Assembly symmetry: D4
Homo-oligomer: 168 residues x 8
Amino acid sequence: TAHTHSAPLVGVLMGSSSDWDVMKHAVAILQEFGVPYEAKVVSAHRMPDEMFDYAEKARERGLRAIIAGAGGAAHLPGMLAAKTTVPVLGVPVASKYLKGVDSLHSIVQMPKGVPVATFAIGEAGAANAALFAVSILSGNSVDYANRLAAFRVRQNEAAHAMVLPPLE
Amino acid sequence: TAHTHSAPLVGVLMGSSSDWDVMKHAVAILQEFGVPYEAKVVSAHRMPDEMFDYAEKARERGLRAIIAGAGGAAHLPGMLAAKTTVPVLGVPVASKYLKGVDSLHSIVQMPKGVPVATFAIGEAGAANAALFAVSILSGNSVDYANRLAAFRVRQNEAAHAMVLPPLE
Amino acid sequence: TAHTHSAPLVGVLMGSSSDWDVMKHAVAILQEFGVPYEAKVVSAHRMPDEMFDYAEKARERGLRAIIAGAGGAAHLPGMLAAKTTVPVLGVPVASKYLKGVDSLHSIVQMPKGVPVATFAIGEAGAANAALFAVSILSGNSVDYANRLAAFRVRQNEAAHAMVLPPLE
Amino acid sequence: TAHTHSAPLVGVLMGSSSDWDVMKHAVAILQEFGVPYEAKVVSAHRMPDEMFDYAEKARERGLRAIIAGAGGAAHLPGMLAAKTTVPVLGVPVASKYLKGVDSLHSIVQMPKGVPVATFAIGEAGAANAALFAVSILSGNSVDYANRLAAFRVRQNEAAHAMVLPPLE
Amino acid sequence: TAHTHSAPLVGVLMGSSSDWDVMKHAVAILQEFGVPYEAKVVSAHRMPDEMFDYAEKARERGLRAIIAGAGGAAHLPGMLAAKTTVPVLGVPVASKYLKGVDSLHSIVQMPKGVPVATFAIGEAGAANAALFAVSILSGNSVDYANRLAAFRVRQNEAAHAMVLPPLE
Amino acid sequence: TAHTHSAPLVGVLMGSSSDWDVMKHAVAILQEFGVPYEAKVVSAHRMPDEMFDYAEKARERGLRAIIAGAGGAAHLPGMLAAKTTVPVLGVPVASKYLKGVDSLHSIVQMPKGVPVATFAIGEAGAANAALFAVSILSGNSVDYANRLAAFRVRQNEAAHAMVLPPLE
Amino acid sequence: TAHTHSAPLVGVLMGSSSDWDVMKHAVAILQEFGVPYEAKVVSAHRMPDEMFDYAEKARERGLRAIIAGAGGAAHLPGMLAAKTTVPVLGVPVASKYLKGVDSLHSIVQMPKGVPVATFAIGEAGAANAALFAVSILSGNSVDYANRLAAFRVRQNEAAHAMVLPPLE
Amino acid sequence: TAHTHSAPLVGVLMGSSSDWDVMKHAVAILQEFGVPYEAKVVSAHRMPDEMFDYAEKARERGLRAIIAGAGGAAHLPGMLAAKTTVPVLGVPVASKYLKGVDSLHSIVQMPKGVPVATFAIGEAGAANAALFAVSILSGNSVDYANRLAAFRVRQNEAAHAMVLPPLE
């Protein structure tokens, strides 16, 4: 029901609904910016064929970026990237024991020929992958360009408004 | 004089000519794909004002991506991204002692609000940042989409042609 | 032409001929033990369809193990295992900067449901994956059990024969 | 009382009953698949002679795999493997301070001659060691082959059934 | 309101009020020692222009040290140091997933030309940056020299007064 | 009052009463084995002179081992060792952010000439340092030799008595 | 004979002449800036009394900073700082196996109460510790402030002069 | 033939003659101090039974310490310690890819009950393990106490004699 669109510009993928705690931060940004999007559970290891199918159809469906979150032996971003030339934006989800060090290594260290744009471990990287998608869309949209400029100014204002309290 | 253009679509920046050994791999991809580009030495720490000026002007100049390489306490990608909404693509350059672990941390771990798309440590990341820039351009260019598709066919063919010799 | 068989029991795969320096150590064990084998270049990222096709066909072809080596964002073992129930034996190949730490994380940290048996970084792991494949065959082969036992006696004798020289 | 069998095919060993929180996930898989098994506390450091005896007897008793978990200076899998040619499947149990990095290093880094198939840190690796054991058994059992294929399809269906909720 | 002065000798900066939990330990020391100080939220990424302005003005305002805390891709201390020759004292704030390893790398690994004096991860480093500031001021103040000597003796007395209880 | 003796054979030192949570495990072993001991707060950084004094007097007082715990930039074991030839047994106490990785590096990595026998991070290393002290004392005491032999047999019995419960 | 002064403002210390390859970079800066300095071999572990004597006398002798380099279990900076209130500037020297990771932990992770200002691993940190000492002197010297400003202009000019060559 | 004694006080063990490059540094100290010693190749994985036999016999043979070097999944020190109450002194030998990080984890992280005294990675640790053995013997030998004291005087004198040359 939720997170569907007939003409999405950004897809948000993850291997499990357990990743939603992190990946929902990507979706929050896309909603805030009014970007047509979809969010789907697509597992590299449990849904390998479906992963390949998604990547194959991405460009013809009009996707401009795929945001993909994964943890541990995190293969979903790199394997999507292997099967489409549409930009893939990888979000390392923190793992229980290695705290996303494994996730980060498995995503960022792509060999020459198949890039994955990688962001910070966890909720920061999820939000930033979405913001980065908006920066891609702003390359040919005054609306997204304007919204991103306004977002930065608002962020700057919010930092100015912060207050440090007296020592207790 | 080398690496200038009157209308670049991608800028390739680094803090020192010592970084060229890595960053030349990005320039090689841009030349191969026929992407108008510029390459410049812009140091976060020795040229802070110049860094800010470059980022300020990137959007009005028509840049569609800035590829930025740095090592150690690698601040150039993040501080460019702080000052422009043009996509910033960060390449960790390996450091002498920590082998780019410091570089990678310094670039990828950006807090929410100011994204840097991060690629592999070293030459692989430099080439991939450039290939990723081409994917960005392919969002609204059939020519760049076709060039990427042809590149991938060539890559696949080259992998098929590889040979494993007898044990010696 | 080198490294083919009409009825292999073990397949040795790697993403590039550059991995042969490590993966040849697996092939040496297989030859020593008289195990019918094939060795092939199959890249997760440059040959994704071919990788899936190889895994799909592994069981019907009679393969009892697939030894797969990869480095960096090492996806080949995990994605083979996503597509076959034949045992997959992963060999992390050392990477230029991270020395196989990235390779190891990328292979061993598979989530529940899709196992990869992982061995040491480099040449030791390649030789051990092959020796482990022989242990798998020894489950229902007295011949292979006997060969392993004889290998271990030779190993033990070789250790006993080692000599520690005078200080110089 | 629990976890005994007169003709086990898989042994599940650990140094302490404190390791049961992790290793019970191996036993759950073995039960689900109907694999005859035993689970025992066998400590490398507090029961060294008993560890040797277990390994010595494994093949003649009909064990096809030994799943062994250990944490810290984790020696149990490698020392079992030194004393039997039956497949040894090592599970790094996370340690209090190093979160299983020490465990992983102590298990996976076996030198050439004595392999240990290593799986992910913690409960994922325990479950996967057991799944891998089932894959070994499927090499000569249609029942285990069928059960494993059915398991994979069930996992795929479960991923398809996952739902991402609306933002709250 | 709080943490202002018309003639501060030490500035305490951080990217967010969320960093106060750590950086308040710097302020506690400055208060205890009677050092005129100010504390301000100045974000490298959300307030880049303001960061440059602060550094530009530091010497002429009479600042003798700037204590700056940041976490993750921690750029605030190094970018302040790029824009002033007043001593910059960097405090790595621990990050959620990497526990300040990223913070430390991003601060301490400055290349030749632009130093940042770096202290321990977290509250210990915040307190110590402030103590170090006092040591700088003691170079031309008998009052600060005396206070620092008295502090050290008091610390020594406090350690002498510690009691180890009986086993319970 | 507690943890004094007129003729101790082992001293247990730590920089703060906060280390007692860990170091009390050393004292528990020494009490169990009936070893004359003392435990004292001696800080490398807050009590440097007192640390040197303790080490200077150790041999003439009859100490046979000094167990020293420290965390972070952990200098107490190495500096005791610099000032006495009596065996120094170092226990890395886990730090808040780096979980004792820093503690371990600062203790174990002593250069040639001044050894520190180093044990596991935390309570395990504290207990083991004390057990190791007993092994030193057993070199010339049948009583300590016997007690250590009996301890090992009891440990073996305790491991035998462990029970793995049914799956719930 | 080399590296002495009757009235040094900065002392450069290291545990061995083998550290000179790194620490000479500090001395080069001090010479360039005309800072009266001394350089000495003072080992924490082989010369512990001498280290304490040096720290004790630092303040009365007029020293404004002590630059101290050490590697491995690097105790020299911290133990100097335990014994003087003169600013101590620590330089981690890379170690053979751990590449200065151990050195860095050992120096930077000082507990509250005894600060060490820590710089980058190796030659960069040595040069920066010296440049930081000049910043300390610039607090109450127009001459040293002027020299720093001129250094930064030269740095900036040198960066502008760098050239990126054609691809070969 | 080299490195034998009819009444050794220290045994120096390693899993391969390849380890001699490191372990010879221990033997050099033993020879210098006149300690009766033996050195042997005893492999945990290739000679498991022989390892157990050596440890079983160590105490009745009069050994006062066993120095054991190993790398990678380094089990030799721990498994010796599991089988004897004679002090075991572990030397991590650097591994090809992980540079002894694996070796160190595998040796130092022993659980409560079975201690291994651990020294630095490589040659420094081998020399120090031997020096530590001499400290053990010094507990009830005035000759060995005097030899250690003389060694330390020599070390101190050698440090004083070191010279720092002019800048080139």
